[PDB]
Design an enzyme around this catalytic site. Structure first.
Site, PDB file in Angstrom:
ATOM      1  N   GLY A   1      -7.755 -38.487 119.165  1.00  0.00           N
ATOM      2  CA  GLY A   1      -6.663 -37.676 118.690  1.00  0.00           C
ATOM      3  C   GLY A   1      -5.015 -37.891 119.214  1.00  0.00           C
TER       4      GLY A   1
ATOM      5  N   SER B   1     -11.887 -42.488 122.537  1.00  0.00           N
ATOM      6  CA  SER B   1     -12.267 -42.110 121.131  1.00  0.00           C
ATOM      7  C   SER B   1     -13.682 -41.446 121.222  1.00  0.00           C
ATOM      8  CB  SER B   1     -12.173 -43.188 120.222  1.00  0.00           C
ATOM      9  OG  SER B   1     -12.569 -42.942 118.967  1.00  0.00           O
ATOM     10  N   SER B   2     -13.637 -40.399 120.335  1.00  0.00           N
ATOM     11  CA  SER B   2     -14.802 -39.696 120.186  1.00  0.00           C
ATOM     12  C   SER B   2     -15.957 -40.601 119.547  1.00  0.00           C
ATOM     13  CB  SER B   2     -14.812 -38.616 119.218  1.00  0.00           C
ATOM     14  OG  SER B   2     -14.635 -39.026 117.950  1.00  0.00           O
ATOM     15  N   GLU B   3     -15.617 -41.676 119.139  1.00  0.00           N
ATOM     16  CA  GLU B   3     -16.410 -42.795 118.465  1.00  0.00           C
ATOM     17  C   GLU B   3     -16.971 -43.875 119.563  1.00  0.00           C
ATOM     18  OE1 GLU B   3     -17.851 -41.713 116.144  1.00  0.00           O
ATOM     19  OE2 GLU B   3     -16.655 -40.727 114.677  1.00  0.00           O
TER      20      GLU B   3
ATOM     21  N   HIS C   1     -12.050 -49.317 113.146  1.00  0.00           N
ATOM     22  CA  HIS C   1     -12.584 -48.082 112.407  1.00  0.00           C
ATOM     23  C   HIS C   1     -11.597 -47.207 111.761  1.00  0.00           C
ATOM     24  CE1 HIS C   1     -14.744 -44.527 111.050  1.00  0.00           C
ATOM     25  NE2 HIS C   1     -14.268 -43.816 111.846  1.00  0.00           N
TER      26      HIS C   1
ATOM     27  N   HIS D   1     -10.700 -44.482 107.970  1.00  0.00           N
ATOM     28  CA  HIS D   1     -11.416 -43.656 107.058  1.00  0.00           C
ATOM     29  C   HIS D   1     -10.388 -44.392 105.576  1.00  0.00           C
ATOM     30  CE1 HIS D   1     -12.943 -39.877 109.654  1.00  0.00           C
ATOM     31  NE2 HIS D   1     -13.099 -41.157 110.060  1.00  0.00           N
TER      32      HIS D   1
ATOM     33  N   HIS E   1     -18.211 -40.587 105.530  1.00  0.00           N
ATOM     34  CA  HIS E   1     -17.258 -40.922 106.719  1.00  0.00           C
ATOM     35  C   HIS E   1     -16.035 -41.823 106.578  1.00  0.00           C
ATOM     36  CE1 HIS E   1     -16.886 -40.900 111.483  1.00  0.00           C
ATOM     37  NE2 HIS E   1     -15.680 -41.331 110.981  1.00  0.00           N
TER      38      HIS E   1
HETATM   39 ZN   LIG Z   1     -13.955 -41.653 111.812  1.00  0.00          ZN
END
Ligand SMILES: [Zn+2]
Ligand SMILES: [Zn+2]
Ligand SMILES: [Zn+2]
Ligand SMILES: [Zn+2]
Lengths: 206, 206, 206, 206
Positions: free
Chosen positions: A44, A71-73, A92, A94, A155
């Protein structure tokens, strides 16, 4: 392979993706294979406010350096490097067209000879799982086994290569393929494809 | 007609195509008629890293100067100059809309009076053949006999004119025509066209 | 919370929206909660000609400072701050995709997990009412009760958050969701959605 | 109202249209009412190579100053100023969305309240006639009698107002309306519209 030289490229890549229209907002994450683990963007923080000091190091156990939130990912970047040992960078995003095809839950077929750029005759679509989840990691790992890029249902897109610029190039290429797919599919279904034999030839020339 | 003044324009054209949204990635190639042969961009080198020294000269026999790798498509630039002796510059790109119509394997009809800019009442679509192949050359040569631009099935677009800027203008114009075609075809099929008689008149005024 | 520091951000936001493609022309308006009332852009003055001196203050009674004309939509910015006490900034624009979905008079469904960004499993569409009308205010107030953003039938989009940058981010995010919706809906109807249970989980992780 | 101050704005407008995506290539023309006639861009000279010296003056008889070639469309700029005496600037371009709707030969209906910006509840589409033809002039003159903008079948868009910036604003607004129309029409036919009564109200508030 200096932490500082890598951090700089990682931010550049995020800036370049926004610049190319492959990503916007707080979406997306990028990492490079570093030491036993990797260097990955933090969760974020706008690409505009990012600096080498914000880049996070996660070791082989998933231990991120203190006082920093990766990162959350991060888990699916992990799975990516384990699924593709030949890969040193994961991107990655979107991106609009890749994401729409993923909402449709479709693989992108052999509509153009450049599809061979992802390593085969398709760009797969991996089953949905909550973002930043371990089950999501199992889905991408499985999809990347025989492909360099995979869409994520409902996603986005994840592409990886030997380095950040080849990883960015590939992700960009898939946005083009996803856009060619959505445009022709609105006019015709099924959209004409090159045969697998032809794709085989193109893969030979690559 | 100095090798150095030509090299500079060739790179500019590649930069301008990316700038106009007519091409992106490692796709595309551009050449100018030079001496007995031509000057053509090299295979797989980003437009950003290109310099006059990278431009390659291929003679009338297909002999490229040593230590340099010409564009994989050099053969169809060859065929273009042989098919159109009036042409001094060839531009090739994988522009989004031109490429989608080529996946549909359709000629672009007389939907706008500017179609006359390519020399007739249509923009043809040439049958697919593996990229950088001699058979691909036979297909484009045949298509350019009576048209200044042709789409390449499952591939992209190739346009040629008397010089690079008129060649770039034309390629750009075809992206517009291809976009008008895809947009109206999604709403109606067949898309209304001007009559051949009308196109004849417009060609007279051109 | 200095009138001058706020005025500057308000114009920036208008400039950023044009920069992101979320608004263009004389359309749109932006305000921040200020003192008992708010600071809002003036009616019909190009973002390029705007200065801190043009920003207008409207008090709790709707009294705008003399010699200045507030945005025709000031009433629905009012209703927004009353409906969402947690919100300190409102952004309104006629973004292309958000506006097309509003012409269709549809809520945007759970096609992507980011829908949760607006506070639920949908982006509603508020019934039409003449612009700058009090009845239009009743419609938006009602829509924002349980959502941070709402489309305006045959009009545009309105998003609000704790500050201008989070308000701009959200509005931008909704343009992406509206674009994913229009693109997939042209190919399939109904467009696949994540279940409410899944959205619940995603809202928990947010 | 100095020939030199006008020439500068005319080129700016051409540059701004390319900048906004409302025109590209050698397409388009712009003029301002000047003395008994008008000042108009010259035929086929790239906006980038234009200078105040290239702007052409045509008198009330259609006499253009020697050694200069006025835009091929000068006749319909003429007809525009005669049809709309309240108008001081005409802008013509081949904007993508306006042109696609014109290929479909449709008026743009009351899908958004901003339609009232062109003076009514529609943007008409004028019957085709060869470009730069006198019969084409009769068609636009007739269409502009009660509207400030009109599409040209299989051609483009023409908008006029009290000055160049209001003329550019309007042309830009029509590209938005044409884009909202094409996007929703691909999903639904007929596309929902505001009633004429509602448009009447909006025209009152304008
Ligand atoms: Zn994502
Ligand atoms: Zn190619
Ligand atoms: Zn509005
Ligand atoms: Zn024209």
């Amino acid at each position: 392979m200096e932490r500082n030289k890598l951090a700089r490229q990682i931010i550049d890549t995020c800036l370049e993706m926004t610049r190319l229209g492959l990503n916007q907002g707080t979406a997306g994450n990028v990492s490079v294979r570093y030491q036993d683990g990797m260097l990955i963007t933090p969760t974020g923080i706008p690409y505009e406010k990012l600096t080498e000091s914000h880049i996070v190091f996660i070791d082989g156990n998933g231990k991120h350096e203190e006082g920093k939130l990766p990162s959350s990912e991060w888990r699916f970047h992990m799975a990516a490097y384990q699924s593709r040992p030949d890969a040193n960078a994961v991107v990655h995003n979107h991106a609009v067209h890749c994401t729409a095809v993923s909402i449709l839950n479709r693989s992108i077929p052999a509509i153009h000879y450049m599809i061979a750029a992802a390593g085969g005759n398709s760009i797969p679509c991996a089953p949905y799982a909550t973002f930043g989840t371990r089950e999501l990691s199992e889905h991408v790992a499985l999809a990347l086994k025989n492909r360099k890029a995979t869409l994520l249902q409902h996603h986005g897109l994840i592409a990886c290569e030997v380095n950040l610029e080849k990883a960015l190039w590939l992700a960009h290429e898939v946005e083009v393929l996803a856009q060619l797919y959505l445009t022709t599919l609105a006019i015709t279904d099924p959209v004409p494809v090159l045969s697998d034999e032809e794709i085989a030839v193109v893969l030979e020339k690559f």
